[PDB]
Subunit: 349 residues, 4 copies
């Protein structure tokens, strides 16, 4: 008994920041507040303000987002003046998630304007926040508008792109777990959500590329991450884009003091789960190699022992689900993979 | 650009508590947590648990709700185990609103089982909580189920019934303000929401009654309060049930340390607004008199001065709206009413 | 897996016809066609046209509705110019149902402006048409707008009001059959649909009245009939307003050459079913007596034998349902009622 | 003020016919009727029946669809027994559209099982029928389920594949016209609809292929055509997949006694419109050449003069729209293209 809110505004391409005003006019907002990640205003602020003001939209306030702490977010949410019609979030994944959550708490339209794509948070119904010092995924609301400027994304640090590659590829293992879950009568698949998620991913995986900062490559990456969010909205849950691989990453977040980027953790987890599933192994290996994902991850010195533990505790994150990692045998296989596999032996310490 | 979630389960009548298990089976919940207001478990707890367990539904936890403090609610919300499918709230208005808010934060189905009807919180998309020590109305989510046992309601303290009468009669003034707002191009009316809110209220207002603990009376009261909540869900905002009269009450809440029951404040506010509107004055006067609402309110010693200030600050609660009290002249009229009116001179 | 379209426009009261322009402006229609029942334009046409034109809405065409024949309706439907945004139907039940069906076939918004209330056709998702010479209830679409002028209704012939009373009171038995059906696992009740249908009916039944042309009485009658239609739209089927009593009437329609008004047949059927249900008998008897419904019906000379046959064949109209009349014993009881009951002995031949 | 019904069931791939029973079980249908196009039962009937019966679903009737005449369809619609829960249509485009329309008239769930893909009728909310001897597109309802078996499609006659290519490629010009329309304030674009239609098409256009009976090629063709229909359902109108190119085809249908396949007419129209738009010309030329669409069309001897007339009359099909062909200048340009263009000089007489 669930309701679907497909975003009204979807713009991925060139020259978007400059035209943000005309882009969001479709929402009929009279009065907005802009929330910028640190340093972001210095880069794009004036242009964004000019653009919005010239589209005859008033700006109540311009603020900076400094953290993803649940308490500070709730405080700030209720500080938002009652005459505000809409929230605009401009920045990285953390900034987006914070503003998204405020809009959720105040039941306000939210426009997502990410300056990087480290994951699909910028398009989805879930927010990643700090809850009692621990990074945690919590229900929020899907953005009403998503505006991604590929020029801006071109300029982002490569860590965020690798992170995005990791969160995208996870759709392959997530869908497999979802099907396994259904076969075990522990859920029901949403066919359309599967179809779009699958199409987004397969489009990306097939795209030729010279480098990861390639415009065509980035446009495909962003389109798919956007799609993933909408697929979640359509399904009414995270399954289209979140399976065991995600549960592994969430488990890591609960005991590591300094977890790596969500996308990075999810990517490694996806590789692992592919070998456990014995499904789409070559595709996943190829994309994560060819893009330099594995290369990059080696430099981070993630521990085998931390993954082994996350694998064991993955099921605790969503105990009513039934992924491969809700089965003890599959956990042991997963752990044996982490100890044996050649790529892992290389990129993990 | 808004989505409507009409509750799946609606049950108002006799022998509901005992059958709560079969009633909620429709939701297909596998594992629930029960939250009881203080003293409520001692009264209905065992029965409720038995009923639920016999319908093959697992109970993860049974807890007590001790406040409506936003911080504690958030803390408790994120303590709810991940395997929980649904939240059931059993108790008074404060208890219900707390559990409802947790369900909102965790995106979980919520079953509302009120043991009193002091207001339409038990059926609506808004929660009344403490925010920085101040009672404040905040967005939440409409319950997925509402189960009201009229026997339990029969046994509630009269103060909650009077409160309920007050929150119900407010529909009359709210709808008028809403129409005024539309005429001033500051919103658009949702015709269906107007229809059902109007029907619930008119049904109640016409009902003959010996006393306020009359079963037919109570059943009507509860039906309308339930309707009000669904009306709000349908409209996508509070306007079907919340106009200037409510803005008055919310304004009182911001400066009074010890506000009265929402319903009580809203009732008095409704009487005042009727005279300002010069609309349905006799109906409102009659119902609030005949039920003993006014008598009851006299005993509370609410101050004329507090109402006058609330009237002046009502507009600040929702400055983008356009109720009668968003116009200075109508505020002066409202304040002259509080100083003059005979009933008010008596009960304030 | 079903979608709900609550009407955008709902207006029941005084001075509605004159203000039809301003009332429908909310729909943002640019170009409409008006369909009038026979004689209806003579009464209200100029006013309606003036009002619409003065609200800056173009009128493509003004036409007359002459029948409820399915073939003529389809032909006329596809003659509607492609530039037409909306259809307005002004007249009696047959006229409304015809225009409603055209709007259904062309997927056009429909505004219902009934000049009588012989039944809830003016507010519901079903149309009553002639199919192979037989009156038949068929799926259509709920109006987007309903505009009922109580002054116009005041002036309608009494037969239509009695018909309306009959179609309204049927909620009581329909809801009982629906509950019975659920208990037998042959359907699932929609709680909200039950609540509103129940509230509309109970409001009406309790209303004091001097005569059936009383303004307060008519306003209540119209509100309820309107509610009944919306109840059906909400449930996604007819059950909130259509039970065995309806099946009886539909069965009569299949073998009678000259059936009486839907409402009239339904009313008598409702009385019968109340006795079969042994539920709300006194209320139903009281309302149908007090309003003069029974006295009116006596003049029509409906046959006991026709009702007995309709009772036997009721189940054939909807064989997958499970009302009381899907059980042989209850049919026998129904027939014994028609042969015995004092009121029926007086008002039927 | 419009409601979206995304299909519950979407299956495109191998071994689908045989498993139709398990596939449709998700719909919880208790009793269905199967409607087969001519000759189709002989090919797949027994298997389909077995499969359905073994999934514990009753089959009320098995019938043959013999045409797309509106009158015969209405007659047959109302002959469907009241206890039927769902209609299953198995066959070509005409067959599918006929059964779809019956489901529309009886407000019944519909499962689309196409044995060819000559167009996106099998996934969309519109039906192509004969109205007064003229092929005409009319509002229906989107299927509740779509089941396409690529093995079956492999074995279809090439003319349907070429037809499908033609109806698919039209998305490129349709979207351009839609944007033009919006710029002229004559409609509002649905961003998500644009995104999926665009993604389906671009996926197909990029797919390498040996032949048009290539399994990967076909799977992509079918996925996109499926997507086009859902895009239409999402938008609440046909614009995502129907622009001037379609208006041209529909205009041909109104004066030709023997029109060619919708898809074929649409494909040629799409080439023409691309040159008028001066947009995506090379892509469209490449795909229609490389697939052998143009060579195939040459054999049909469509007349230049017919296209010129269709171009002039295109606007009459939907006069309230504002496509390029709602502007006189663009019409002469289109007509000069038909007289001049090298490809057209070759493939048209
Ligand atoms: Zn993720
Ligand atoms: Zn209230
Ligand atoms: Zn009826
Ligand atoms: Zn087409």
């Amino acid at each position: 008994s669930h309701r679907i809110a497909i975003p009204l505004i979807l713009e991925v391409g060139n020259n978007k920041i400059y035209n943000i005003g005309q882009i969001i006019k479709k929402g009929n907002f009279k009065r907005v507040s802009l929330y910028f990640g640190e340093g972001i205003y210095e880069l794009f602020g004036e242009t964004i303000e000019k653009s919005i003001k010239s589209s005859n939209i008033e700006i109540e306030a311009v603020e900076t987002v400094k953290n993803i702490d649940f308490d500070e977010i709730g405080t700030n949410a209720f500080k938002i003046p009652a005459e505000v019609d809409a929230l605009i979030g401009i920045g990285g994944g953390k900034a987006i998630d914070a503003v998204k959550y405020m809009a959720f708490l105040r039941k306000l339209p939210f426009i997502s304007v990410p300056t990087s794509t480290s994951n699909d948070g910028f398009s989805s119904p879930v927010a990643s926040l700090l809850i009692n010092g621990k990074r945690t995924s919590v229900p929020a609301k899907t953005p009403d508008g998503i505006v991604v400027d590929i020029d801006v994304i071109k300029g982002s640090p490569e860590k965020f792109i690798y992170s995005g590659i990791g969160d995208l590829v996870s759709n392959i293992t997530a869908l497999y777990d979802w099907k396994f879950e259904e076969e075990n009568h522990k859920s029901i698949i949403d066919d359309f959500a599967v179809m779009i998620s699958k199409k987004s991913v397969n489009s990306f995986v097939r795209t030729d590329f010279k480098s990861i900062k390639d415009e065509v490559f980035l446009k495909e990456l962003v389109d798919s991450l956007t799609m993933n969010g909408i697929a979640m909205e359509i399904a009414g849950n995270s399954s289209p884009a979140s399976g065991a691989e995600h549960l592994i990453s969430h488990a890591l977040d609960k005991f590591l003091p300094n977890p790596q980027l969500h996308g990075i953790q999810v990517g490694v987890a996806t590789y692992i789960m592919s070998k456990v599933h014995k499904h789409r192994e070559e595709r996943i290996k190829k994309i994560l190699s060819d893009t330099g994902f594995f290369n990059y991850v080696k430099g981070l010195n993630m521990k085998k022992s931390d993954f082994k533990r996350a694998i064991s505790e993955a099921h605790l994150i969503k105990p009513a689900r039934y992924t491969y990692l809700h089965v003890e045998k599959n956990c042991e296989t997963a752990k044996e993979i982490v100890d044996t596999d050649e790529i892992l032996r290389n990129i993990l310490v």
